Design an enzyme around this catalytic site. Structure first.
Site, PDB file in Angstrom:
ATOM      1  N   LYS A   6      10.920  33.194  15.555  1.00  0.00           N
ATOM      2  CA  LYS A   6      11.156  31.788  15.482  1.00  0.00           C
ATOM      3  C   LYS A   6      10.607  30.969  16.509  1.00  0.00           C
ATOM      4  CE  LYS A   6      14.240  29.332  13.088  1.00  0.00           C
ATOM      5  NZ  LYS A   6      15.413  28.462  13.300  1.00  0.00           N
ATOM      6  N   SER A  56       2.751  10.156   3.079  1.00  0.00           N
ATOM      7  CA  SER A  56       1.742  11.366   3.271  1.00  0.00           C
ATOM      8  C   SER A  56       2.386  12.030   4.406  1.00  0.00           C
ATOM      9  CB  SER A  56       0.514  10.911   3.540  1.00  0.00           C
ATOM     10  OG  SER A  56       0.180   9.835   4.442  1.00  0.00           O
ATOM     11  N   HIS A 100       0.361   3.941  -1.746  1.00  0.00           N
ATOM     12  CA  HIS A 100       0.007   4.712  -0.474  1.00  0.00           C
ATOM     13  C   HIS A 100      -1.351   4.601  -0.230  1.00  0.00           C
ATOM     14  CE1 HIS A 100       0.515   6.572   3.237  1.00  0.00           C
ATOM     15  NE2 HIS A 100       0.872   7.830   2.713  1.00  0.00           N
ATOM     16  N   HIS A 154       3.800  -4.137   3.468  1.00  0.00           N
ATOM     17  CA  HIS A 154       4.100  -3.029   4.043  1.00  0.00           C
ATOM     18  C   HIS A 154       5.529  -2.726   4.142  1.00  0.00           C
ATOM     19  CE1 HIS A 154       3.881   0.315   7.128  1.00  0.00           C
ATOM     20  NE2 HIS A 154       2.620   0.362   6.738  1.00  0.00           N
ATOM     21  N   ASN A 204      -2.598  -5.225   5.218  1.00  0.00           N
ATOM     22  CA  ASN A 204      -2.426  -4.145   6.029  1.00  0.00           C
ATOM     23  C   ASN A 204      -3.746  -3.555   6.232  1.00  0.00           C
ATOM     24  OD1 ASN A 204      -2.999  -2.203   3.814  1.00  0.00           O
ATOM     25  ND2 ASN A 204      -0.776  -2.886   2.877  1.00  0.00           N
ATOM     26  N   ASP A 245      -5.318  -1.184   4.805  1.00  0.00           N
ATOM     27  CA  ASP A 245      -6.047  -1.070   3.488  1.00  0.00           C
ATOM     28  C   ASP A 245      -6.894  -2.290   2.967  1.00  0.00           C
ATOM     29  OD1 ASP A 245      -5.316   1.562   3.575  1.00  0.00           O
ATOM     30  OD2 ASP A 245      -4.130   1.512   1.796  1.00  0.00           O
TER      31      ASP A 245
HETATM   32  C1  LIG Z   1      -2.403   2.369   4.768  1.00  0.00           C
HETATM   33  C2  LIG Z   1      -1.605   2.592   3.312  1.00  0.00           C
HETATM   34  S1  LIG Z   1      -0.235   1.828   2.937  1.00  0.00           S
HETATM   35  C3  LIG Z   1      -0.853   1.040   1.737  1.00  0.00           C
HETATM   36  C4  LIG Z   1       0.103   0.067   1.122  1.00  0.00           C
HETATM   37  N1  LIG Z   1       0.056  -0.322  -0.359  1.00  0.00           N
HETATM   38  C5  LIG Z   1      -0.488  -1.345  -0.771  1.00  0.00           C
HETATM   39  O1  LIG Z   1      -1.323  -2.152   0.031  1.00  0.00           O
HETATM   40  C6  LIG Z   1      -0.247  -2.052  -1.984  1.00  0.00           C
HETATM   41  C7  LIG Z   1       0.570  -2.936  -2.444  1.00  0.00           C
HETATM   42  N2  LIG Z   1       1.786  -3.192  -1.284  1.00  0.00           N
HETATM   43  C8  LIG Z   1       2.940  -2.660  -1.906  1.00  0.00           C
HETATM   44  O2  LIG Z   1       3.009  -2.451  -3.126  1.00  0.00           O
HETATM   45  C9  LIG Z   1       4.144  -2.891  -1.035  1.00  0.00           C
HETATM   46  O3  LIG Z   1       4.038  -3.893   0.046  1.00  0.00           O
HETATM   47  C10 LIG Z   1       4.421  -1.394  -0.212  1.00  0.00           C
HETATM   48  C11 LIG Z   1       3.392  -1.263   0.742  1.00  0.00           C
HETATM   49  C12 LIG Z   1       4.446  -0.273  -1.318  1.00  0.00           C
HETATM   50  C13 LIG Z   1       5.526  -1.718   0.603  1.00  0.00           C
HETATM   51  O4  LIG Z   1       6.691  -1.231  -0.377  1.00  0.00           O
HETATM   52  P1  LIG Z   1       8.263  -2.062  -0.325  1.00  0.00           P
HETATM   53  O5  LIG Z   1       8.819  -1.639   1.111  1.00  0.00           O
HETATM   54  O6  LIG Z   1       8.965  -1.539  -1.439  1.00  0.00           O
HETATM   55  O7  LIG Z   1       7.828  -3.583  -0.212  1.00  0.00           O
HETATM   56  P2  LIG Z   1       8.948  -4.820  -0.122  1.00  0.00           P
HETATM   57  O8  LIG Z   1       7.892  -6.143   0.164  1.00  0.00           O
HETATM   58  O9  LIG Z   1      10.147  -4.646   0.415  1.00  0.00           O
HETATM   59  O10 LIG Z   1       9.182  -5.078  -1.950  1.00  0.00           O
HETATM   60  C14 LIG Z   1      10.016  -5.975  -2.293  1.00  0.00           C
HETATM   61  C15 LIG Z   1       9.218  -6.636  -3.773  1.00  0.00           C
HETATM   62  O11 LIG Z   1       7.940  -7.298  -3.461  1.00  0.00           O
HETATM   63  C16 LIG Z   1       7.113  -6.580  -4.154  1.00  0.00           C
HETATM   64  N3  LIG Z   1       5.647  -6.687  -3.160  1.00  0.00           N
HETATM   65  C17 LIG Z   1       5.515  -6.038  -2.238  1.00  0.00           C
HETATM   66  N4  LIG Z   1       4.167  -6.067  -1.835  1.00  0.00           N
HETATM   67  C18 LIG Z   1       3.361  -6.650  -2.566  1.00  0.00           C
HETATM   68  C19 LIG Z   1       2.280  -6.951  -3.168  1.00  0.00           C
HETATM   69  N5  LIG Z   1       1.292  -6.705  -1.934  1.00  0.00           N
HETATM   70  N6  LIG Z   1       1.834  -7.353  -4.097  1.00  0.00           N
HETATM   71  C20 LIG Z   1       2.728  -7.862  -5.355  1.00  0.00           C
HETATM   72  N7  LIG Z   1       4.039  -7.572  -4.965  1.00  0.00           N
HETATM   73  C21 LIG Z   1       4.468  -6.790  -3.762  1.00  0.00           C
HETATM   74  C22 LIG Z   1       7.382  -5.142  -4.411  1.00  0.00           C
HETATM   75  O12 LIG Z   1       6.653  -4.563  -5.286  1.00  0.00           O
HETATM   76  C23 LIG Z   1       8.850  -5.278  -4.465  1.00  0.00           C
HETATM   77  O13 LIG Z   1       9.055  -5.765  -5.908  1.00  0.00           O
HETATM   78  O1  LIG Z   2       3.404   3.305   7.059  1.00  0.00           O
HETATM   79  C1  LIG Z   2       3.333   3.327   5.963  1.00  0.00           C
HETATM   80  O2  LIG Z   2       4.264   3.443   5.189  1.00  0.00           O
HETATM   81  C2  LIG Z   2       2.081   3.299   5.042  1.00  0.00           C
HETATM   82  C3  LIG Z   2       0.854   3.259   6.167  1.00  0.00           C
HETATM   83  O3  LIG Z   2       0.622   2.120   6.614  1.00  0.00           O
HETATM   84  C4  LIG Z   2       0.237   4.435   6.460  1.00  0.00           C
HETATM   85  O4  LIG Z   2       0.813   5.296   6.121  1.00  0.00           O
HETATM   86  O5  LIG Z   2      -0.826   4.238   7.144  1.00  0.00           O
END
Ligand SMILES: CCSCCNC(=O)CCNC(=O)[C@H](O)C(C)(C)COP(=O)(O)OP(=O)(O)OC[C@H]1O[C@@H](n2cnc3c(N)ncnc32)[C@H](O)[C@@H]1O
Ligand SMILES: O=C([O-])CC(=O)C(=O)O
Ligand SMILES: O=C([O-])CC(=O)C(=O)O
Ligand code: NA
Ligand code: NA
Ligand code: NA
Lengths: 439, 435
Positions: free
Chosen positions: B162, B245, B275, B321, B376, B378
């Site tokens: 280990k 990831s 993600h 985020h 963010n 992306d």
């Molecule tokens: C570097 C790699 S990380 C690439 C990142 N992924 C993306 O850029 C894709 C879009 N972003 C999201 O889906 C989201 O922002 C995350 C990143 C998955 C975070 O997820 P959570 O911590 O669940 O977000 P929370 O704000 O507490 O969610 C509250 C409600 O608002 C909507 N909500 C939150 N954000 C958004 C959004 N951007 N558009 C529409 N609805 C949203 C959600 O669908 C939900 O019902």
């Molecule tokens: O931190 C997160 O949850 C998603 C993100 O921005 C990354 O993994 O780069």
């Protein structure tokens, strides 16, 4: 004229989605309620003991063992439909129960079994991929890769890419789940039979037979001479299907799925966890250990001979494989179910390798308790599964984890469907460093 | 020669084990509460795992051993040309907690070049992929397939103490890092596998430079792109432990699956739309918007496209985020990179990304669901690749896959050096929460 047919699986699931959404809404109103504490131990100790994720179809009681919608394994054995031959519960009936919360009729299971047989065919590129594997590539690496590769066939991935409303996620998730379930025994058999990819990869499955029967046929253990093995396989696949949400394979599937990776990519991640020595390999290790023990003490052995070998194992700083568990603190009802399978089969009871497993199960827990280093001195299901496969001539233990991989698609795919039906978010905890825990 | 990386890691293992002992004495100390929200809400806000190399502040963004992105840009060694920090220097820092000398980084870069060749069966596997197979599926599979080369898997089977698990874990990690840009290039160049699969790298050049060469963008005429790639790969390497990831890598690794299998699981999570696949989805969405609103457009046209996306039940990719509640300093770093490059600023696709960044946060706030309306990283990464000639967004997350090996592999090494157990939380059903 009018159907006589009872609801199919998708229809049965549709019937229960609204009620679960309503229950979810009610729980969500209590979002701010404190249900426990986080300690330093939880962070450094792999979240052990920390109730931190949702899983609907099964809940593991540390004292009593697994329950499926509150039902025991014995309840499931009694109530779930059986095959057209044999006496063991069908894993596809277990899938129905896990998903819907209801015991299907035999007729409903027959129809579902037909769907699984029909949906089992593979694209030519998957056969090409499998043919490219080197002979020595570990079977769990092969299985994980081939399952991920089937994401070429993902309805969810394609629908999401084209633009899919969040409300419409569960249905392609369901479709992909059934597709994967249908295909995975064939993929597993291809891993087992690298010299027969073209036949095993294309042979039509008997659509009147059950999932395990047809898996056994693909493995080259078809026919009436293998009827006990068919029943073993049914029971094994049903017993290993789900073990709540926190086990590595189930959790990995949920985790990857929570980013909206499709079921093929998601369950591939679960399989990569099953490939781990601390998660999927134990049944293989148990059999190797038992056979090594047998070589030393013979086929005629005393309780003392077994005690002495157990003490040497422990004195050497090694674990007795198939004993203990991360959550169970008492005998695993899955273990007892497999031992009871042997109980009605004189040839198994006479098998010296089985006798050694049995005797070890009678001696090891007291030795392990005396030695004092485990929290659970009891056998888990991995103590028994390998020897039963071995008895029936499935004697290459490297592939026991592959059969585990087939079984363990069942529960995690059910939860992915529910994750999407409920609209659960990405799994994204917070981390901290040791410096942050110090001050 | 100065200490190599393994030697530098060996030097700091004792102190970390001692700190771990001290923390373990406080095992019973309560540090937080679990609420129903944490169970149903994907563990959001629940401090529940260890990660050493980086900690994500919700207000300030990522820190690496307490250093900002700007600190790293100043302090980390650069390549033989260019001005951006090297991702292999970031790896050194993440692993050791120390800034390497330029001489140490040069030697490490040479090791990564030397270790980059692939077994024939990996080339054969990749040639079996159909053209319809998504690039992230290709990448995930090819990385898992490299477990044929795992020293940890073989040593574990054979008998390994280990206390020594970390060493073959380190060896496999460096092997994977060396190989993954070549694997990624084979995903990008399916008609040139035999050549790209075997071509020797420039042994004097840095990891990003050689990745660019394998992508067909080598040489001095591509020096700007090499700097973009260095910055990008350094910025995306680690984002604490709880991102999908990183977490999946740790989780699978906690069962003692080797680094190839473990990072394959990470890649499968990175492939998710919410993600790393958001990088792809951003530019698909931007280009779709461009096609709809035209070359000359109003702020309302952009607002309308945003609102139409939301009304459709879809996310606006590259916004929000799980932890960040403020602008992402990785996003800012990429926009600052663009700011000094008139050609990039003039690119209409970049202009549309920029204009969207000025409107989307208000629309997301109006909609009222997100906790973070800010961009963010992306939001900006794919358009920069587009500018430099990478115009198929289905490949974008592949570069993220290369970068995001860095941090998770560092933590797997530490997980094994410390002897951290299997990750195995307890689940519950909704009925159990209803009680
Ligand atoms: C570097 C790699 S990380 C690439 C990142 N992924 C993306 O850029 C894709 C879009 N972003 C999201 O889906 C989201 O922002 C995350 C990143 C998955 C975070 O997820 P959570 O911590 O669940 O977000 P929370 O704000 O507490 O969610 C509250 C409600 O608002 C909507 N909500 C939150 N954000 C958004 C959004 N951007 N558009 C529409 N609805 C949203 C959600 O669908 C939900 O019902
Ligand atoms: O931190 C997160 O949850 C998603 C993100 O921005 C990354 O993994 O780069
Ligand atoms: O429950 C666990 O942690 C391990 C597991 O998958 C099993 O025992 O089937
Ligand atoms: Na061929
Ligand atoms: Na609101
Ligand atoms: Na709000």
């Amino acid at each position: 004229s009018g159907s006589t047919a009872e609801p199919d699986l998708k229809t049965a699931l549709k019937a229960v989605i609204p009620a679960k959404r309503e229950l979810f809404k009610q729980v969500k109103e209590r979002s701010d309620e404190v249900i426990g504490e986080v300690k330093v131990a939880n962070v450094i100790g792999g979240m052990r003991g920390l109730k931190s994720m949702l899983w609907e179809g099964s809940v593991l009681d540390p004292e009593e063992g697994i329950r499926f919608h509150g039902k025991t394994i014995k309840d499931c054995q009694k109530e779930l439909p059986k095959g057209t031959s044999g006496t063991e519960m069908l894993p596809e009936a277990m899938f129905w129960l896990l998903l819907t919360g209801q015991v299907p009729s035999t007729n409903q299971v027959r129809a579902f079994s037909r769907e699984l047989a029909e949906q089992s065919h593979l694209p030519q590129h998957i056969l090409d991929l499998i043919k490219s594997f080197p002979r020595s590539m570990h079977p769990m690496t092969q299985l994980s890769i081939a399952v991920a590769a089937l994401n070429t066939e993902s309805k969810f991935a394609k629908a999401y890419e084209k633009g899919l409303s969040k409300a419409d996620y569960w249905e392609p998730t369901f479709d992909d789940s059934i597709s994967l379930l249908a295909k995975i025994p064939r993929v597993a058999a291809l891993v087992f039979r690298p010299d027969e990819v073209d036949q095993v990869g294309t042979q039509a499955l008997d659509a009147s037979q059950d999932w395990s029967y047809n898996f056994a046929e693909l493995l080259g253990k078809g026919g009436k001479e293998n009827q006990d093995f068919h029943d073993l396989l049914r029971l094994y696949l049903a017993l290993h299907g789900d073990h709540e949400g926190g086990n590595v394979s189930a959790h990995a599937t949920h985790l990857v799925g929570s980013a909206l990776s499709d079921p093929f990519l998601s369950y591939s991640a679960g399989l990569l966890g099953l490939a781990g020595p601390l998660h999927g390999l134990a049944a293989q290790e148990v059999l190797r250990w038992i056979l090594a023990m047998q070589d030393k003490i013979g086929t005629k052995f005393t309780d003392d001979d077994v005690r002495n070998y157990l003490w040497d194992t422990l004195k050497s700083g090694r674990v007795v494989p198939g004993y203990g568990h991360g959550v169970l603190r008492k005998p695993d009802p899955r273990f007892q179910a497999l031992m009871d399978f042997a109980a009605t089969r004189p040839d198994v009871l006479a098998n010296p390798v089985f006798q050694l497993v049995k005797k070890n199960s009678e001696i090891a827990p007291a030795v392990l308790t005396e030695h004092g280093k485990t929290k659970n001195p009891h056998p888990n299901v991995d103590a028994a599964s390998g020897v039963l496969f071995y008895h029936y001539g499935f004697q290459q233990p490297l592939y026991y984890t592959v059969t585990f991989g087939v079984s363990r698609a069942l529960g995690p795919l059910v939860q992915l469907i529910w994750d999407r039906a409920l609209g659960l978010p990405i799994e994204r905890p917070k981390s901290i460093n040791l410096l942050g825990l110090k001050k």
